[PDB]
Amino acid sequence: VKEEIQAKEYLENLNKELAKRTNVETEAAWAYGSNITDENEKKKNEISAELAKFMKEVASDTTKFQWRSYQSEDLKRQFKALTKLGYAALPEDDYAELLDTLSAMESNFAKVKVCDYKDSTKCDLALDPEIEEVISKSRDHEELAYYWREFYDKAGTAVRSQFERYVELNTKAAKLNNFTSGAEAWLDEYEDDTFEQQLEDIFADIRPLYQQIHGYVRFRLRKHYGDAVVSETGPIPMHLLGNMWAQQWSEIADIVSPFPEKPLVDVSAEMEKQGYTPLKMFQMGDDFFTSMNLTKLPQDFWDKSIIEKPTDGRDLVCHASAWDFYLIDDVRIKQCTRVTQDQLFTVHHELGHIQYFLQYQHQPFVYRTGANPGFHEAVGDVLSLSVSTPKHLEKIGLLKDYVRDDEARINQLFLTALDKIVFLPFAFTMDKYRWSLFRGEVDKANWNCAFWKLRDEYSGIEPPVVRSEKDFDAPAKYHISADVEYLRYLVSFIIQFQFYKSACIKAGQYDPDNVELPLDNCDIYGSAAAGAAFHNMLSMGASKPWPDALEAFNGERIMSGKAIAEYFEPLRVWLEAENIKNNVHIGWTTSNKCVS
Template sequence: MIRLYLNMLPKIFIIGCFCILAIIAKDVSIEEEEYNARNFLILLNRQTEKDSNRLSLANWAYASNLTEENLKNQLAVAAEVAKNEKEAWQRVIQYNWKTFSDPSLKRQFQKYSVLGISALPEEKFKNLNKIVSDMEAIYSKAKICPFGAKTAETEECKLGLEPELTNILATSRNPEELKHVWLEWRNAVGPKCRLLYEQYVNLTNEAARLNNFTDVSEYWLDDYEDPNFKSQIQSLWEQLKPLYLQIHAYVRTKLRGKYGEIVSEKGPIPMHLLGNMWAQSWSNVADFMLPYPDAKDENLTEELKKQNYTATKIFRTAEEFFKSINLSEMPETFWNNSVLEKPSDREIVCHASAWDFFDQKDFRIKQCTEVTGEHFITAHHEMGHIEYFLQYKDQPVKFREGANDGFHEAIGDLIALSVESTKHLRKIGLVHSEKDDPKQVLNNLFKLGLSKITFLPFGYLMDLWRWDVFSGKTKPEDYNCKWWELREKYQGVEPPVDRSEEDFDPAGKYHIIADVPYLRYFISFVIQFQFHRSLCEKAGQYEHNNLEKPLHECDIYQNQAAGNVLKQMLAMGSSKPWPEAMEVVTGQRKMDASGILEYFKPLQTWLEEENRKSNAFIGWEPSKKVCVRTRQELLDAQKDNTTTIPAQA
């Protein structure tokens, strides 16, 4: 046995040498490929920066001046950039990037390996961009007549969404006027977008399949880097639902007291009465349902106007907050190039937005700012996006995005949680009382709940509807009725009038027709409170179960310890998976709804007691509103006095 083994040694040694040489050769090959890939990536990043800058400039030109010439230029630039992206992608996929040892290099290649809509053939790509731009133009240019106008041809028929219709819904208490505005806005947008939207779904699904996804929903969810992300979101909603049900029951009771029988005791809430075009925020109806109506209300809008705030002063005030926590001031390009007020000489997309032009120096906001408390908060939200851009601007171009898209939406709202506190408003001279009145604190918490808590089911169902549309589970002939089925199931709201499939009510919301995923906002509304709690702890302004330092009274203004932690996370961009970014601020690697629940715990306790006192029904019975395939079916149903027809499955 020993001799046999010794005789085998040379063979074993020779075979072993070959194996070692093969491994060495393989390692050398991998190292050489990584070296080449790194050099290629330097050139690719430069090209991507250049193309992203050109495309952003073209998109800005059109969004801030809706002309056919600007649209033509936007589409032409988009087509050129798509061509470059496709050529770069063809080179990217030649690399065996999954074997790379450098995690940053591997992660950048992974991001470049998903081409997006540029994977479409050139004509289809152009067509898709044209369809989305056309829907945006329909939405942005839509005008309706005022309530009671005698003819549609009158000069008065120039009411746009921003600011006219938004203001009417916020301030009018005439249910017929509110119904008119609600209905006419959807009539002006939905039917014109319906066929375009079907084409959009087909083309974006084709693009998703060319990127090896089954449909757009899978493509959108891929960015969260977790195959179980849907179930995580569902769990968060189930955790938050009891609080929503309490605020829903209380508001319905108060609306019924004001408007009578048009609000049922146990049914869904007629959404046109909730102060917002989409019933996503109910804070505009707080005035007649405050917990303590006699408590002095220091109205932020009135104070801003009294102190002669302008759009620019609002944004300068927001900038000062970020600077106070050791984040960046706005570059000069921001003040020179942003559109902070609605121009009178041209049509623009008024939906507030923040823009990164990918040259590391040009960052802008486009907002049709009104001097109101709501726009004061929106300014902080949009500037939060700009701060994120500024902190990660030195990252490789593919990492210049939020850890996930919910992070990007959360940052400005996180700051706004401090800004909205009376403690902060007192510091900057917008509240004059010397100390907080506990009744007013609860009123403020209630008003914030009418913005934050009521948004949650809407933020969730927007993409639930689209996921089923993209997957084919919801067919085009069922688009509208499925929309209302989800609005009722999750929000407990109903339309003021019966609907049919000849309407297309989802198009009345900008993000639907503008191809903007919406789950990010639901995520944001959860994690902003998770971030807020952690930063407040670092600022020494919050302690669990300490009634002297409750979470809802924290203000991190001027606290650089909190700001430095936030800054560290923002600078990461998307260079690491989002749980790692989450961990930097919170020490946690998962989204957690306990922060928002703790913030609103005093309100939930109060609501539960009030609902018990009034014997309010918790939840809602099925709506008696009709949704059918055609208007003729609708007429027949009404003629037969049919009270309800089930929405199409």
């Protein structure tokens, strides 16, 4: 009708206004996140409250248009997105209380300090970097357990009453948008009613490999720590796995690697010896993208980013993140960067977000996000997969005197699995837990043990000490304290293998029927063929449902476990044999580390 013509002009104008108002909210959030004070908290929450109020006016104005009657799929999609208010649907007082609750949790988490194990006078150890360094480096099980407990008590238990209020307010918000719970609100971002089932099916296919890796790691840990510390048949004590949440185990690769007489890629020491800085690491990431004929970082990036931990003793959120300011070319990273191999991957991870932001900044505001949350998280990881290859690391002079025999290949495959397969059950449990609270499936009296129950069922790990319903451990993970959906990372770790396989084929770097070009040594550095595929997909933003974005990249429309399995198939074959040959116990008894 004539109405659809006016509507298109309504949208064009409203999109620009939302960008500009979001800009101002993002600036205040940035200011808080990079400098936590009471004054910046109030500024952030007051701006948010005002944007919330305007969003409600907008939702209500969508009803004045017959938008579901229109011809244009594109107009209807944009209107649909403006009806989805999220937390902004709350009454203004409930919204302000929710923001205050979220602030309390995120700043509790960011301000955690603990006492040194060897010196209880020295009480200024932060997660990043001091506690993370001990967890990743110490092989003293008693020190490890000490830091685990100190951290979980302060980051987790201390915000129980706040976490509860947040679940209530999150649930109320979802119901006001006519979702059953916050779980359905999160899942709506994947635009697919069978999405949970799809992930269950993929997870069930990779679980057997996970159990083989688990079994082997447990066997190797028993030889290091002995049977008093690690049982044969029980869940692995999580504090021994190189990471505070046992989400990835690559930091203990030096004690669990298949062939310890053969090389294991660890380039941290060479980075340090070649004088690498944070600045250099970001410049390398930048080079990687521009090498593929993708977009160079703008000057605002270099001028406004924070790529090193401030040295002025202020409080900030050190958890690494990427920020879109919704103008032109104002994109930033906040990373407390350290010169290590894992941090090099993180740098590429974060720069994948930046690239996505630049690729879609010509889109209308509602379309300036990922095709789905998982797509956003995968982009940088596709590059990190290349960066991590011995091929790439020899090219940039970080890996010296490396012979890629069959045993070094198994070592590298295993190292990657400790980051990529191990994480899958972990990532699944973070949202399974929250979903189950959001949906009202667990009584408040059982919330802590329901967490550790899932961590046992899916990952076969447990706490180093007995916990109970007096503790509350979930918020000790950043994203749980900060209310960041975690499924995006599960989706990412599956789909990034679909992107990488396809990028590798396009780059001439992978042929199944040619042993010179195996998937696990593919480097896509310099490939404009791969870059083109990325451009086609990333530039779409959220303008189409995600199957359409994937189709733009490689012609497929389906999320699949095929690629991640193909990548690790040589590992699976070897590891199955090695477990049988060493009579390794697979599976685990129920944990008894959480008392009701």
